[PDB]
Amino acid sequence: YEWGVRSTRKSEPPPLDRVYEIPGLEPITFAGKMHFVPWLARPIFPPWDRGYKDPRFYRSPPLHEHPLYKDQACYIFHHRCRLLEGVKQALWLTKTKLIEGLPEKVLSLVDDPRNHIENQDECVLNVISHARLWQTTEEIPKRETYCPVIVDNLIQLCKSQILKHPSLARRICVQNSTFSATWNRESLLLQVRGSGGARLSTKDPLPTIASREEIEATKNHVLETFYPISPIIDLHECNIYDVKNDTGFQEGYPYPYPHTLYLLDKANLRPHRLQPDQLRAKMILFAFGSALAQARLLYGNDAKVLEQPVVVQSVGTDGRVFHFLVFQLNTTDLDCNEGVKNLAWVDSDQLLYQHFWCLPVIKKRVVVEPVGPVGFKPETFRKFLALYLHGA
Amino acid sequence: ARNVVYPLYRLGGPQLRVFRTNFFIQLVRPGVAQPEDTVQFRIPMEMTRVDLRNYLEGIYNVPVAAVRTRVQHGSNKRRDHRNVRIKKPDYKVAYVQLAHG
Amino acid sequence: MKYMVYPQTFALNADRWYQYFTKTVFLSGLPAALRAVACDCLLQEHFYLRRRRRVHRYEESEVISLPFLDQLVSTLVGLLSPHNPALAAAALDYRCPVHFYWVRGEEIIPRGHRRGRIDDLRYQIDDKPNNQIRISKQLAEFVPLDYSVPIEIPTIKCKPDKLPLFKRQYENHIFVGSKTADPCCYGHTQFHLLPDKLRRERLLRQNCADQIEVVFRANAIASLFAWTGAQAMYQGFWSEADVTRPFVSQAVITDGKYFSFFCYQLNTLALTTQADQNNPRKNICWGTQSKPLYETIEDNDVKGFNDDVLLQIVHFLLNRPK
Amino acid sequence: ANFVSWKSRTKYTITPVKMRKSGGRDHTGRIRVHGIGGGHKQRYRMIDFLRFRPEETKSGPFEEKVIQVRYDPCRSADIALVAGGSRKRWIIATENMQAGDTILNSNHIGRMAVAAREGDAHPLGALPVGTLINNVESEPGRGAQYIRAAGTCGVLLRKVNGTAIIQLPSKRQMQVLETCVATVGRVSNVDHNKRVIGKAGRNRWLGKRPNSGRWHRKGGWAGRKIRPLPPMKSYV
Amino acid sequence: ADRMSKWTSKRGPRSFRGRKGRGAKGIGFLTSGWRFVQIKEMVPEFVVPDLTGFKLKPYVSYLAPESEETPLTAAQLFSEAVAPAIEKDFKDNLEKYGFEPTQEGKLFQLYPRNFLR
Amino acid sequence: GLEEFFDDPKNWGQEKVKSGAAWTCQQLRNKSNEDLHKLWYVLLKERNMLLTLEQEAKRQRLPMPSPERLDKVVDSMDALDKVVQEREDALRLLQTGQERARPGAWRRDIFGRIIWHKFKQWVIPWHLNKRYNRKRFFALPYVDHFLRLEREKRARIKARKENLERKKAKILLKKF
Amino acid sequence: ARGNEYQPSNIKRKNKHGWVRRLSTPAGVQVILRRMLKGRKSLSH
RNA sequence: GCUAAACCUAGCCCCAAACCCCACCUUACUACCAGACAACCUUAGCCAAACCAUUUACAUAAAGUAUAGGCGAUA
RNA sequence: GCUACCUAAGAACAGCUAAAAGAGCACACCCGUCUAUGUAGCAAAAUAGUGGGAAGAUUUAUAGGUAGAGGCGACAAACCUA
RNA sequence: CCUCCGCAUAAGCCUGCGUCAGAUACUGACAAUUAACAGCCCAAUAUCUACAAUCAACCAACAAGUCAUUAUUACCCUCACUGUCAACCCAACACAGGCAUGCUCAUAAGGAAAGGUUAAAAAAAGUAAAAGGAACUCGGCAAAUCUUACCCC
Ligand SMILES: [Mg+2]
Ligand SMILES: [Mg+2]
Ligand SMILES: [Mg+2]
Ligand SMILES: [Mg+2]
Ligand SMILES: [Mg+2]
Ligand SMILES: [Mg+2]
Ligand SMILES: [Mg+2]
Ligand SMILES: [Mg+2]
Ligand SMILES: [Mg+2]
Ligand SMILES: [Mg+2]
Ligand SMILES: [Mg+2]
Ligand SMILES: [Mg+2]
Ligand SMILES: [Mg+2]
Ligand SMILES: [Mg+2]
Ligand SMILES: [Mg+2]
Ligand SMILES: [Mg+2]
């Protein structure tokens, strides 16, 4: 069954006049008239091309003739790629072992009360209320507005701890930063072109979480495969690409080391919004891409086990739910399916608050639920603060 | 210029120059209170505010700071002895704010 | 129907007209690691940060200066929080709307079925400061309320329309950037970025070389008056309940390179004819001429960074409530 | 009129496509079919009725995974988002088809009969006689056209010569080349037959305008007509 | 319902009123976001001369002799411009005398005319 | 300066302002192209001043001082334009032989009337221009009857005119 | 109840009785020709 | 004595002779972008036949003749 | 451009009872049961009161389509510019 | 004293109670509505786009739903044009009718039912009514009250 009906397809040109078929005679067409007349033969106009180059009326060369066209197809993962298999697919692509729950090294940074922010609960409640209710003149602010706002306000609340931790002056929060990283898995050329959310960038690299013994122990772990779904599904297959590992910044840039990738799913519409598993997969892939770009910049484009593993954190969020990830890249030898494997600690579906009531729900003139968050969970913000404080 | 075909410009072509300008304008007394730096003109309908700016700055050496235009609709209500409407011509009005105070 | 007053306005000499609409008197003047960080922000937005898409001049403002100003505000707030405890708890807003609706003067309806009837002159300011800092404790008055200044407020001899200024009828909003329920209700500083239409180069081409300071000054007067009036009306004052204490705010308005600093003190919400018939008060706006933070950026180096301008920004951020 | 069919899309995709109702009007603008008009707005989900469509650069039997089974507004039977290799596609879901199931699509006609498993697509020659099939093709590679409604199941009766005999849900018999593919089992939503509209409003939602109020006399055609079952429809 | 009144941009819904103009020649184009790109070369540049020292006032003295009208013709222009050189070089390749085979390659092509006024 | 839009301050209010004679075409033909170019702007400034005077006189409900000089200026500008056009036409005829500056062609419109279609400037060829191809430059057979009817209407009008002329002439002859 | 059958709208006016529509079909071309022959000051709407 | 009354030429009728700057098909009177779309095909009916149904007109002389025709109206 | 039906993409539906309702009371809104007036009228079908529906098969703005040997019709031989 | 309204946008109309002078909300002349609001857009070739909305969180569904890009190639060097008035439109009228939307939910906005007099009939609208309470009438029509039960379709 061919898609596209004839009545919609482009109309076939009318049959040529028999005068053209007749060999020895030159047909009389209305070309000399410079306009159509039904009683003359239809001219055969030679193909036309404007002599000069004109943007806004420019036609690109056919795809195969593009300089970067390559028979080998590179599968690109970008900000708007939604993996079908989610976390399994991301782990297979990045050659990663998953550990449920954040590492003790980061989790313990908030156990000590000194790192605890003053009036954490009240401040986080105020942040939530400002993001969801007080943000704009609109009665019910949309996600496209309260997701970036909530993330930024939480980051500012954490940054308020510069008093306790002067080391937090060595980090900045860059926006519109884009990184690119390419690598091979089972002879599949995979690229990640990560853009979108904010990048917390430090002047110093993050300390390694896992020990060399754990890194070696990763050898025995075997990548969970999935059949018949290929790992490439949902990745943009592209035959016109440029294999380049770009960290997003010119050499010599201060604050070079990525420290957190704050990814936000601010789409108003549920279908346009990533599922939690797909968002976690995106976090995995972007953290891996940034770490791999760092590794390629530092230790060169060599497929080898990293002697100094690169650590990248990431926080995916939808404005209410958060997902926390700490990715340790300890090998650029991705092609082989066996050997030491990168490893990611993940904490999934940590919901800051169960729900927010922008208007007071009234039943029979009785306020049942007051305006404000319900089911607030300060544990999620403790994890957020732990990630922010890690490295300081 | 007006009532003349403008030579079509293609990208990278020469500058469009008019040598014997066809636009004639009138400096008119404003009908309402206006700022001290504002001058009111009645303009041919085909003249843009950019055209008026260049016209004033080139022919009269008047430093123009800002230009605004509006198309005043001439009344078509009046009727002759044959009950046929007499059309008062529409005209463009330009407000020019002088520069350098 | 009300005049929509635009802070960032192409109208010529709009500063005087805004002074009249606000009953504001304008006064010239004011009542190492930071340098490294400012240069870092400039170079991040100009040289270091790789851009996938080519940047066109008409979007250079939005895609370079706006992130640059955001980075400046955020990093400077973080760095000066130790020296300004109130700045730690402050709320930083990016492009949050600021609405102020007020009445100033009266007009006799010129034409129509309502001809000859007295109608108030309503104005609405809808600003979107690029950044702004809101606090829960009000700043200290820059000058005592009832501060008599000999300078006289400019008077407009024609209709407000003649300054390009058009009327509409839409929601009347009085908004400080967050709803009234937000504890952080007072203003600290507003960072404004001038739009591309108001480029210094464009004004020079348009023969508005005199109007660069006018643009900065008008933006400051309008935006700061709207912000302070919104704060006062959040506190409950209005034309018939004029403010019992001055409402202070600060602003820095930049084109990306040139910065100008303004301090505004709202002493009067009694702007209507009835409440202003015998009102000696008048709002005050201190302003400084625009100065270039840097001369030029060549690849990896910023030439002629202005430590004085950076210190002006730092001092504004270091201002604290009493 | 300027009626242009909305069915202009040329590339298969999973996204619901924005349809345009006709109201029973032909392209000339005149009513061609009565009782059609209005109803809830719908989006078309491109169904791949050619179940054995090996992916580009691939060939031979292949498996797929059922991501989900979804209600389809445009069809009595529900659909399934079946994904294989590096592609996804909508198909017609069979009765006991759950998310996570594995569906095999093969073109191999083995000497013996394949063990029929509900949901998989095999050439008719590969099925045991008497199996319940659906989404049958008139010709090899034409694409499924028969037994596509909810709960409909054809029967594989005979496999004489290189041909297969199919009892359609209307009980008519159909001869097709055994190479043509057909999925095993009965179509999903088997209980569609027992759906109660309840209110005229629900018919209007579905998009069926009320019948004409004019009274018609019933002619000779009206009486119950008992006929011998029609002969086999052959496609060989 | 009015057919005898001229169709102008002041009549019709918002789309009509925006679309129709008043004869002003275009100055540029529209890009994404309705942003207007103005092309400098499309803006007519008034070539105003230097009037300093010019001795021709707008009016002419009434004490001026009256002369018969002799509209310039191609023959007259040829005689007054080309004929002398032709005679000299005949006594002693028309491009040398002034003829231009093709208007193409000129800034000011006489036909099709490509200059204003 | 804006003062150039108004007559001399001494002339302001004068009932009559004496003016010379309008430039004649023959007089202008002696002037160089640069001289004509400068005189065009001299006359343009004078014309702007006189139009301003006319409008202000209408506003003040007073007669315009010496209204004839506006007509003189318009005549001078028309003569200058005619001289420049004559020179341009002569040069065009010499260099190309074309008697019209704008390309055009005799074409039959959709109504069967022969018109002089003046070509427009396009960036794409006519066979590709969509709007041009929509425009029709041929009359179908059904237009012949209306062509005949219009011809006969014109003939009737002409016959009425000529017969009336003859009647009037005969009446005049009888009267004298 | 009746009388106000004319609900003016310039879009409908021009799309129903406009010059382009009249020239679209030969019948409308003949309508314009009839108006021209009669001498109507307004050939189209 | 008020409404009013008149008025002669504006033109027209029939013949002869004679053949008769710019804008505009898009929403016409709209400076400036890839078209493809192109016309031809018996007149009918009223009416007459006292209905209606086949049928019923569209220089001179031969001549209303030969012929046609519900062999009749008529042609 | 009314009206019958349809197509595209929009909009409106307070409050109360109930609870996911071609649910009840009842605004806006749609309609037009009964009465009075009007009958060259305010109106070539209206006014006042009264009344039916008013989250739906609802109402409605915009643009488009179907044309008379026809269209459209929850058939009233309805409606298709009084 | 009234307030159905009113103010704006849309649509429609097109200068249609602004000034001056003449007449007798008319005629002639003069003036006016200034863009930020709105309209007027988008370089190609492929390639993406299962997961409604409903405070979107539980639940709950059916009628199954308005909202998304990437890859490469081109490309900045330059804020035009048009609507902006009114007491307004469709109904032959300064027509008690028709007329979408946002706010105001009775108004800060908008308006005047009485030309003057008398207080006859008949007529219209309304209010009050002794005792009775459908005896009126085709019928409880209308009005007043808030009110049961049984039948056809
Ligand atoms: Mg029936
Ligand atoms: Mg209508
Ligand atoms: Mg008869
Ligand atoms: Mg008879
Ligand atoms: Mg309700
Ligand atoms: Mg109901
Ligand atoms: Mg019946
Ligand atoms: Mg009947
Ligand atoms: Mg304008
Ligand atoms: Mg009255
Ligand atoms: Mg009376
Ligand atoms: Mg009684
Ligand atoms: Mg009785
Ligand atoms: Mg009783
Ligand atoms: Mg009785
Ligand atoms: Mg009753």
UniProtKB/Swiss-Prot annotation, chain B:
Domain of life, source organism: Eukaryota
Report the subcellular localization: Mitochondrion
Main subcellular location of this protein, as a coarse class: mitochondrion
Instruction: Output one GO MF annotation.
Output: RNA binding
* GO BP annotation list: mitochondrial translation; translation
Any idea which UniProt keywords this protein has? Mitochondrion, Ribonucleoprotein, Ribosomal protein
Task: Spell out the GO cellular component terms annotated for this protein, sorted alphabetically and separated by semicolons.
Answer: fibrillar center; mitochondrial inner membrane; mitochondrial large ribosomal subunit; mitochondrion
Q: What interactions and quaternary structure are annotated?
A: Component of the mitochondrial large ribosomal subunit (mt-LSU). Mature mammalian 55S mitochondrial ribosomes consist of a small (28S) and a large (39S) subunit. The 28S small subunit contains a 12S ribosomal RNA (12S mt-rRNA) and 30 different proteins. The 39S large subunit contains a 16S rRNA (16S mt-rRNA), a copy of mitochondrial valine transfer RNA (mt-tRNA(Val)), which plays an integral structural role, and 52 different proteins.
- Family note: Belongs to the universal ribosomal protein uL23 family.
Name assigned to this protein: Large ribosomal subunit protein uL23m
Organism in which the protein naturally occurs: Homo sapiens (Human)
Gene, per the UniProt record: MRPL23
> What fragment of the whole protein does this chain represent?
2 to 102 of 153
UniProtKB/Swiss-Prot annotation, chain E:
> Where found, per UniProt?
Mitochondrion
Q: Subunit structure, per the record?
A: Component of the mitochondrial large ribosomal subunit (mt-LSU). Mature mammalian 55S mitochondrial ribosomes consist of a small (28S) and a large (39S) subunit. The 28S small subunit contains a 12S ribosomal RNA (12S mt-rRNA) and 30 different proteins. The 39S large subunit contains a 16S rRNA (16S mt-rRNA), a copy of mitochondrial valine transfer RNA (mt-tRNA(Val)), which plays an integral structural role, and 52 different proteins. Interacts with BCL2.
Entry protein name:
Large ribosomal subunit protein mL41
Say which family it is in.
Belongs to the mitochondrion-specific ribosomal protein mL41 family.
- Superkingdom is Eukaryota
Annotated keywords: Apoptosis, Cell cycle, Mitochondrion, Ribonucleoprotein, Ribosomal protein, Transit peptide
Primary role: Component of the mitochondrial ribosome large subunit. Also involved in apoptosis and cell cycle. Enhances p53/TP53 stability, thereby contributing to p53/TP53-induced apoptosis in response to growth-inhibitory condition. Enhances p53/TP53 translocation to the mitochondria. Has the ability to arrest the cell cycle at the G1 phase, possibly by stabilizing the CDKN1A and CDKN1B (p27Kip1) proteins.
| UniProt GO cellular component terms | mitochondrial inner membrane; mitochondrial large ribosomal subunit; mitochondrion; ribonucleoprotein complex
The encoding gene: MRPL41
> Could you tell me which species this protein originates from?
Homo sapiens
- Taken from the record, one Pfam family name reads MRP-L27
Curated annotation (Swiss-Prot), chain F:
Q: Which UniProt keywords apply?
A: Acetylation, Mitochondrion, Ribonucleoprotein, Ribosomal protein, Transit peptide
Q: Which domain of life is it from?
A: Eukaryota
This entry's Gene Ontology molecular function terms read: structural constituent of ribosome
Specify whether Ribonucleoprotein is a keyword of the entry. Answer: yes
Subcellular location, in the record's words? Answer: Mitochondrion
User: Where is the signal peptide, in residue numbers?
Assistant: none
> What coarse category fits the chief subcellular location reported for this protein?
mitochondrion
Subunit info? Component of the mitochondrial large ribosomal subunit (mt-LSU). Mature mammalian 55S mitochondrial ribosomes consist of a small (28S) and a large (39S) subunit. The 28S small subunit contains a 12S ribosomal RNA (12S mt-rRNA) and 30 different proteins. The 39S large subunit contains a 16S rRNA (16S mt-rRNA), a copy of mitochondrial valine transfer RNA (mt-tRNA(Val)), which plays an integral structural role, and 52 different proteins.
Q: What is this protein called?
A: Large ribosomal subunit protein uL29m
Q: What is the lineage of its organism?
A: Eukaryota, Metazoa, Chordata, Craniata, Vertebrata
Portion of the full sequence shown:
63 to 238 of 250
Swiss-Prot record, chain G:
UniProt keyword annotation of Transmembrane helix present: no
GO CC, alphabetical: mitochondrial inner membrane; mitochondrial large ribosomal subunit; mitochondrial ribosome; mitochondrion
Main localization, broad class: mitochondrion
Q: Give the location in the cell.
A: Mitochondrion
**Some GO term, biological process aspect, for this entry: which one?**
translation
Name which cysteines form disulfide bonds. Answer: none
Give the quaternary structure. Component of the mitochondrial large ribosomal subunit (mt-LSU). Mature mammalian 55S mitochondrial ribosomes consist of a small (28S) and a large (39S) subunit. The 28S small subunit contains a 12S ribosomal RNA (12S mt-rRNA) and 30 different proteins. The 39S large subunit contains a 16S rRNA (16S mt-rRNA), a copy of mitochondrial valine transfer RNA (mt-tRNA(Val)), which plays an integral structural role, and 52 different proteins.
The family this protein is said to belong to = Belongs to the bacterial ribosomal protein bL34 family.
Q: What is this protein called?
A: Large ribosomal subunit protein bL34m
Tell me which species this is from.
Homo sapiens
**Whole protein: which stretch is covered?**
48 to 92 of 92
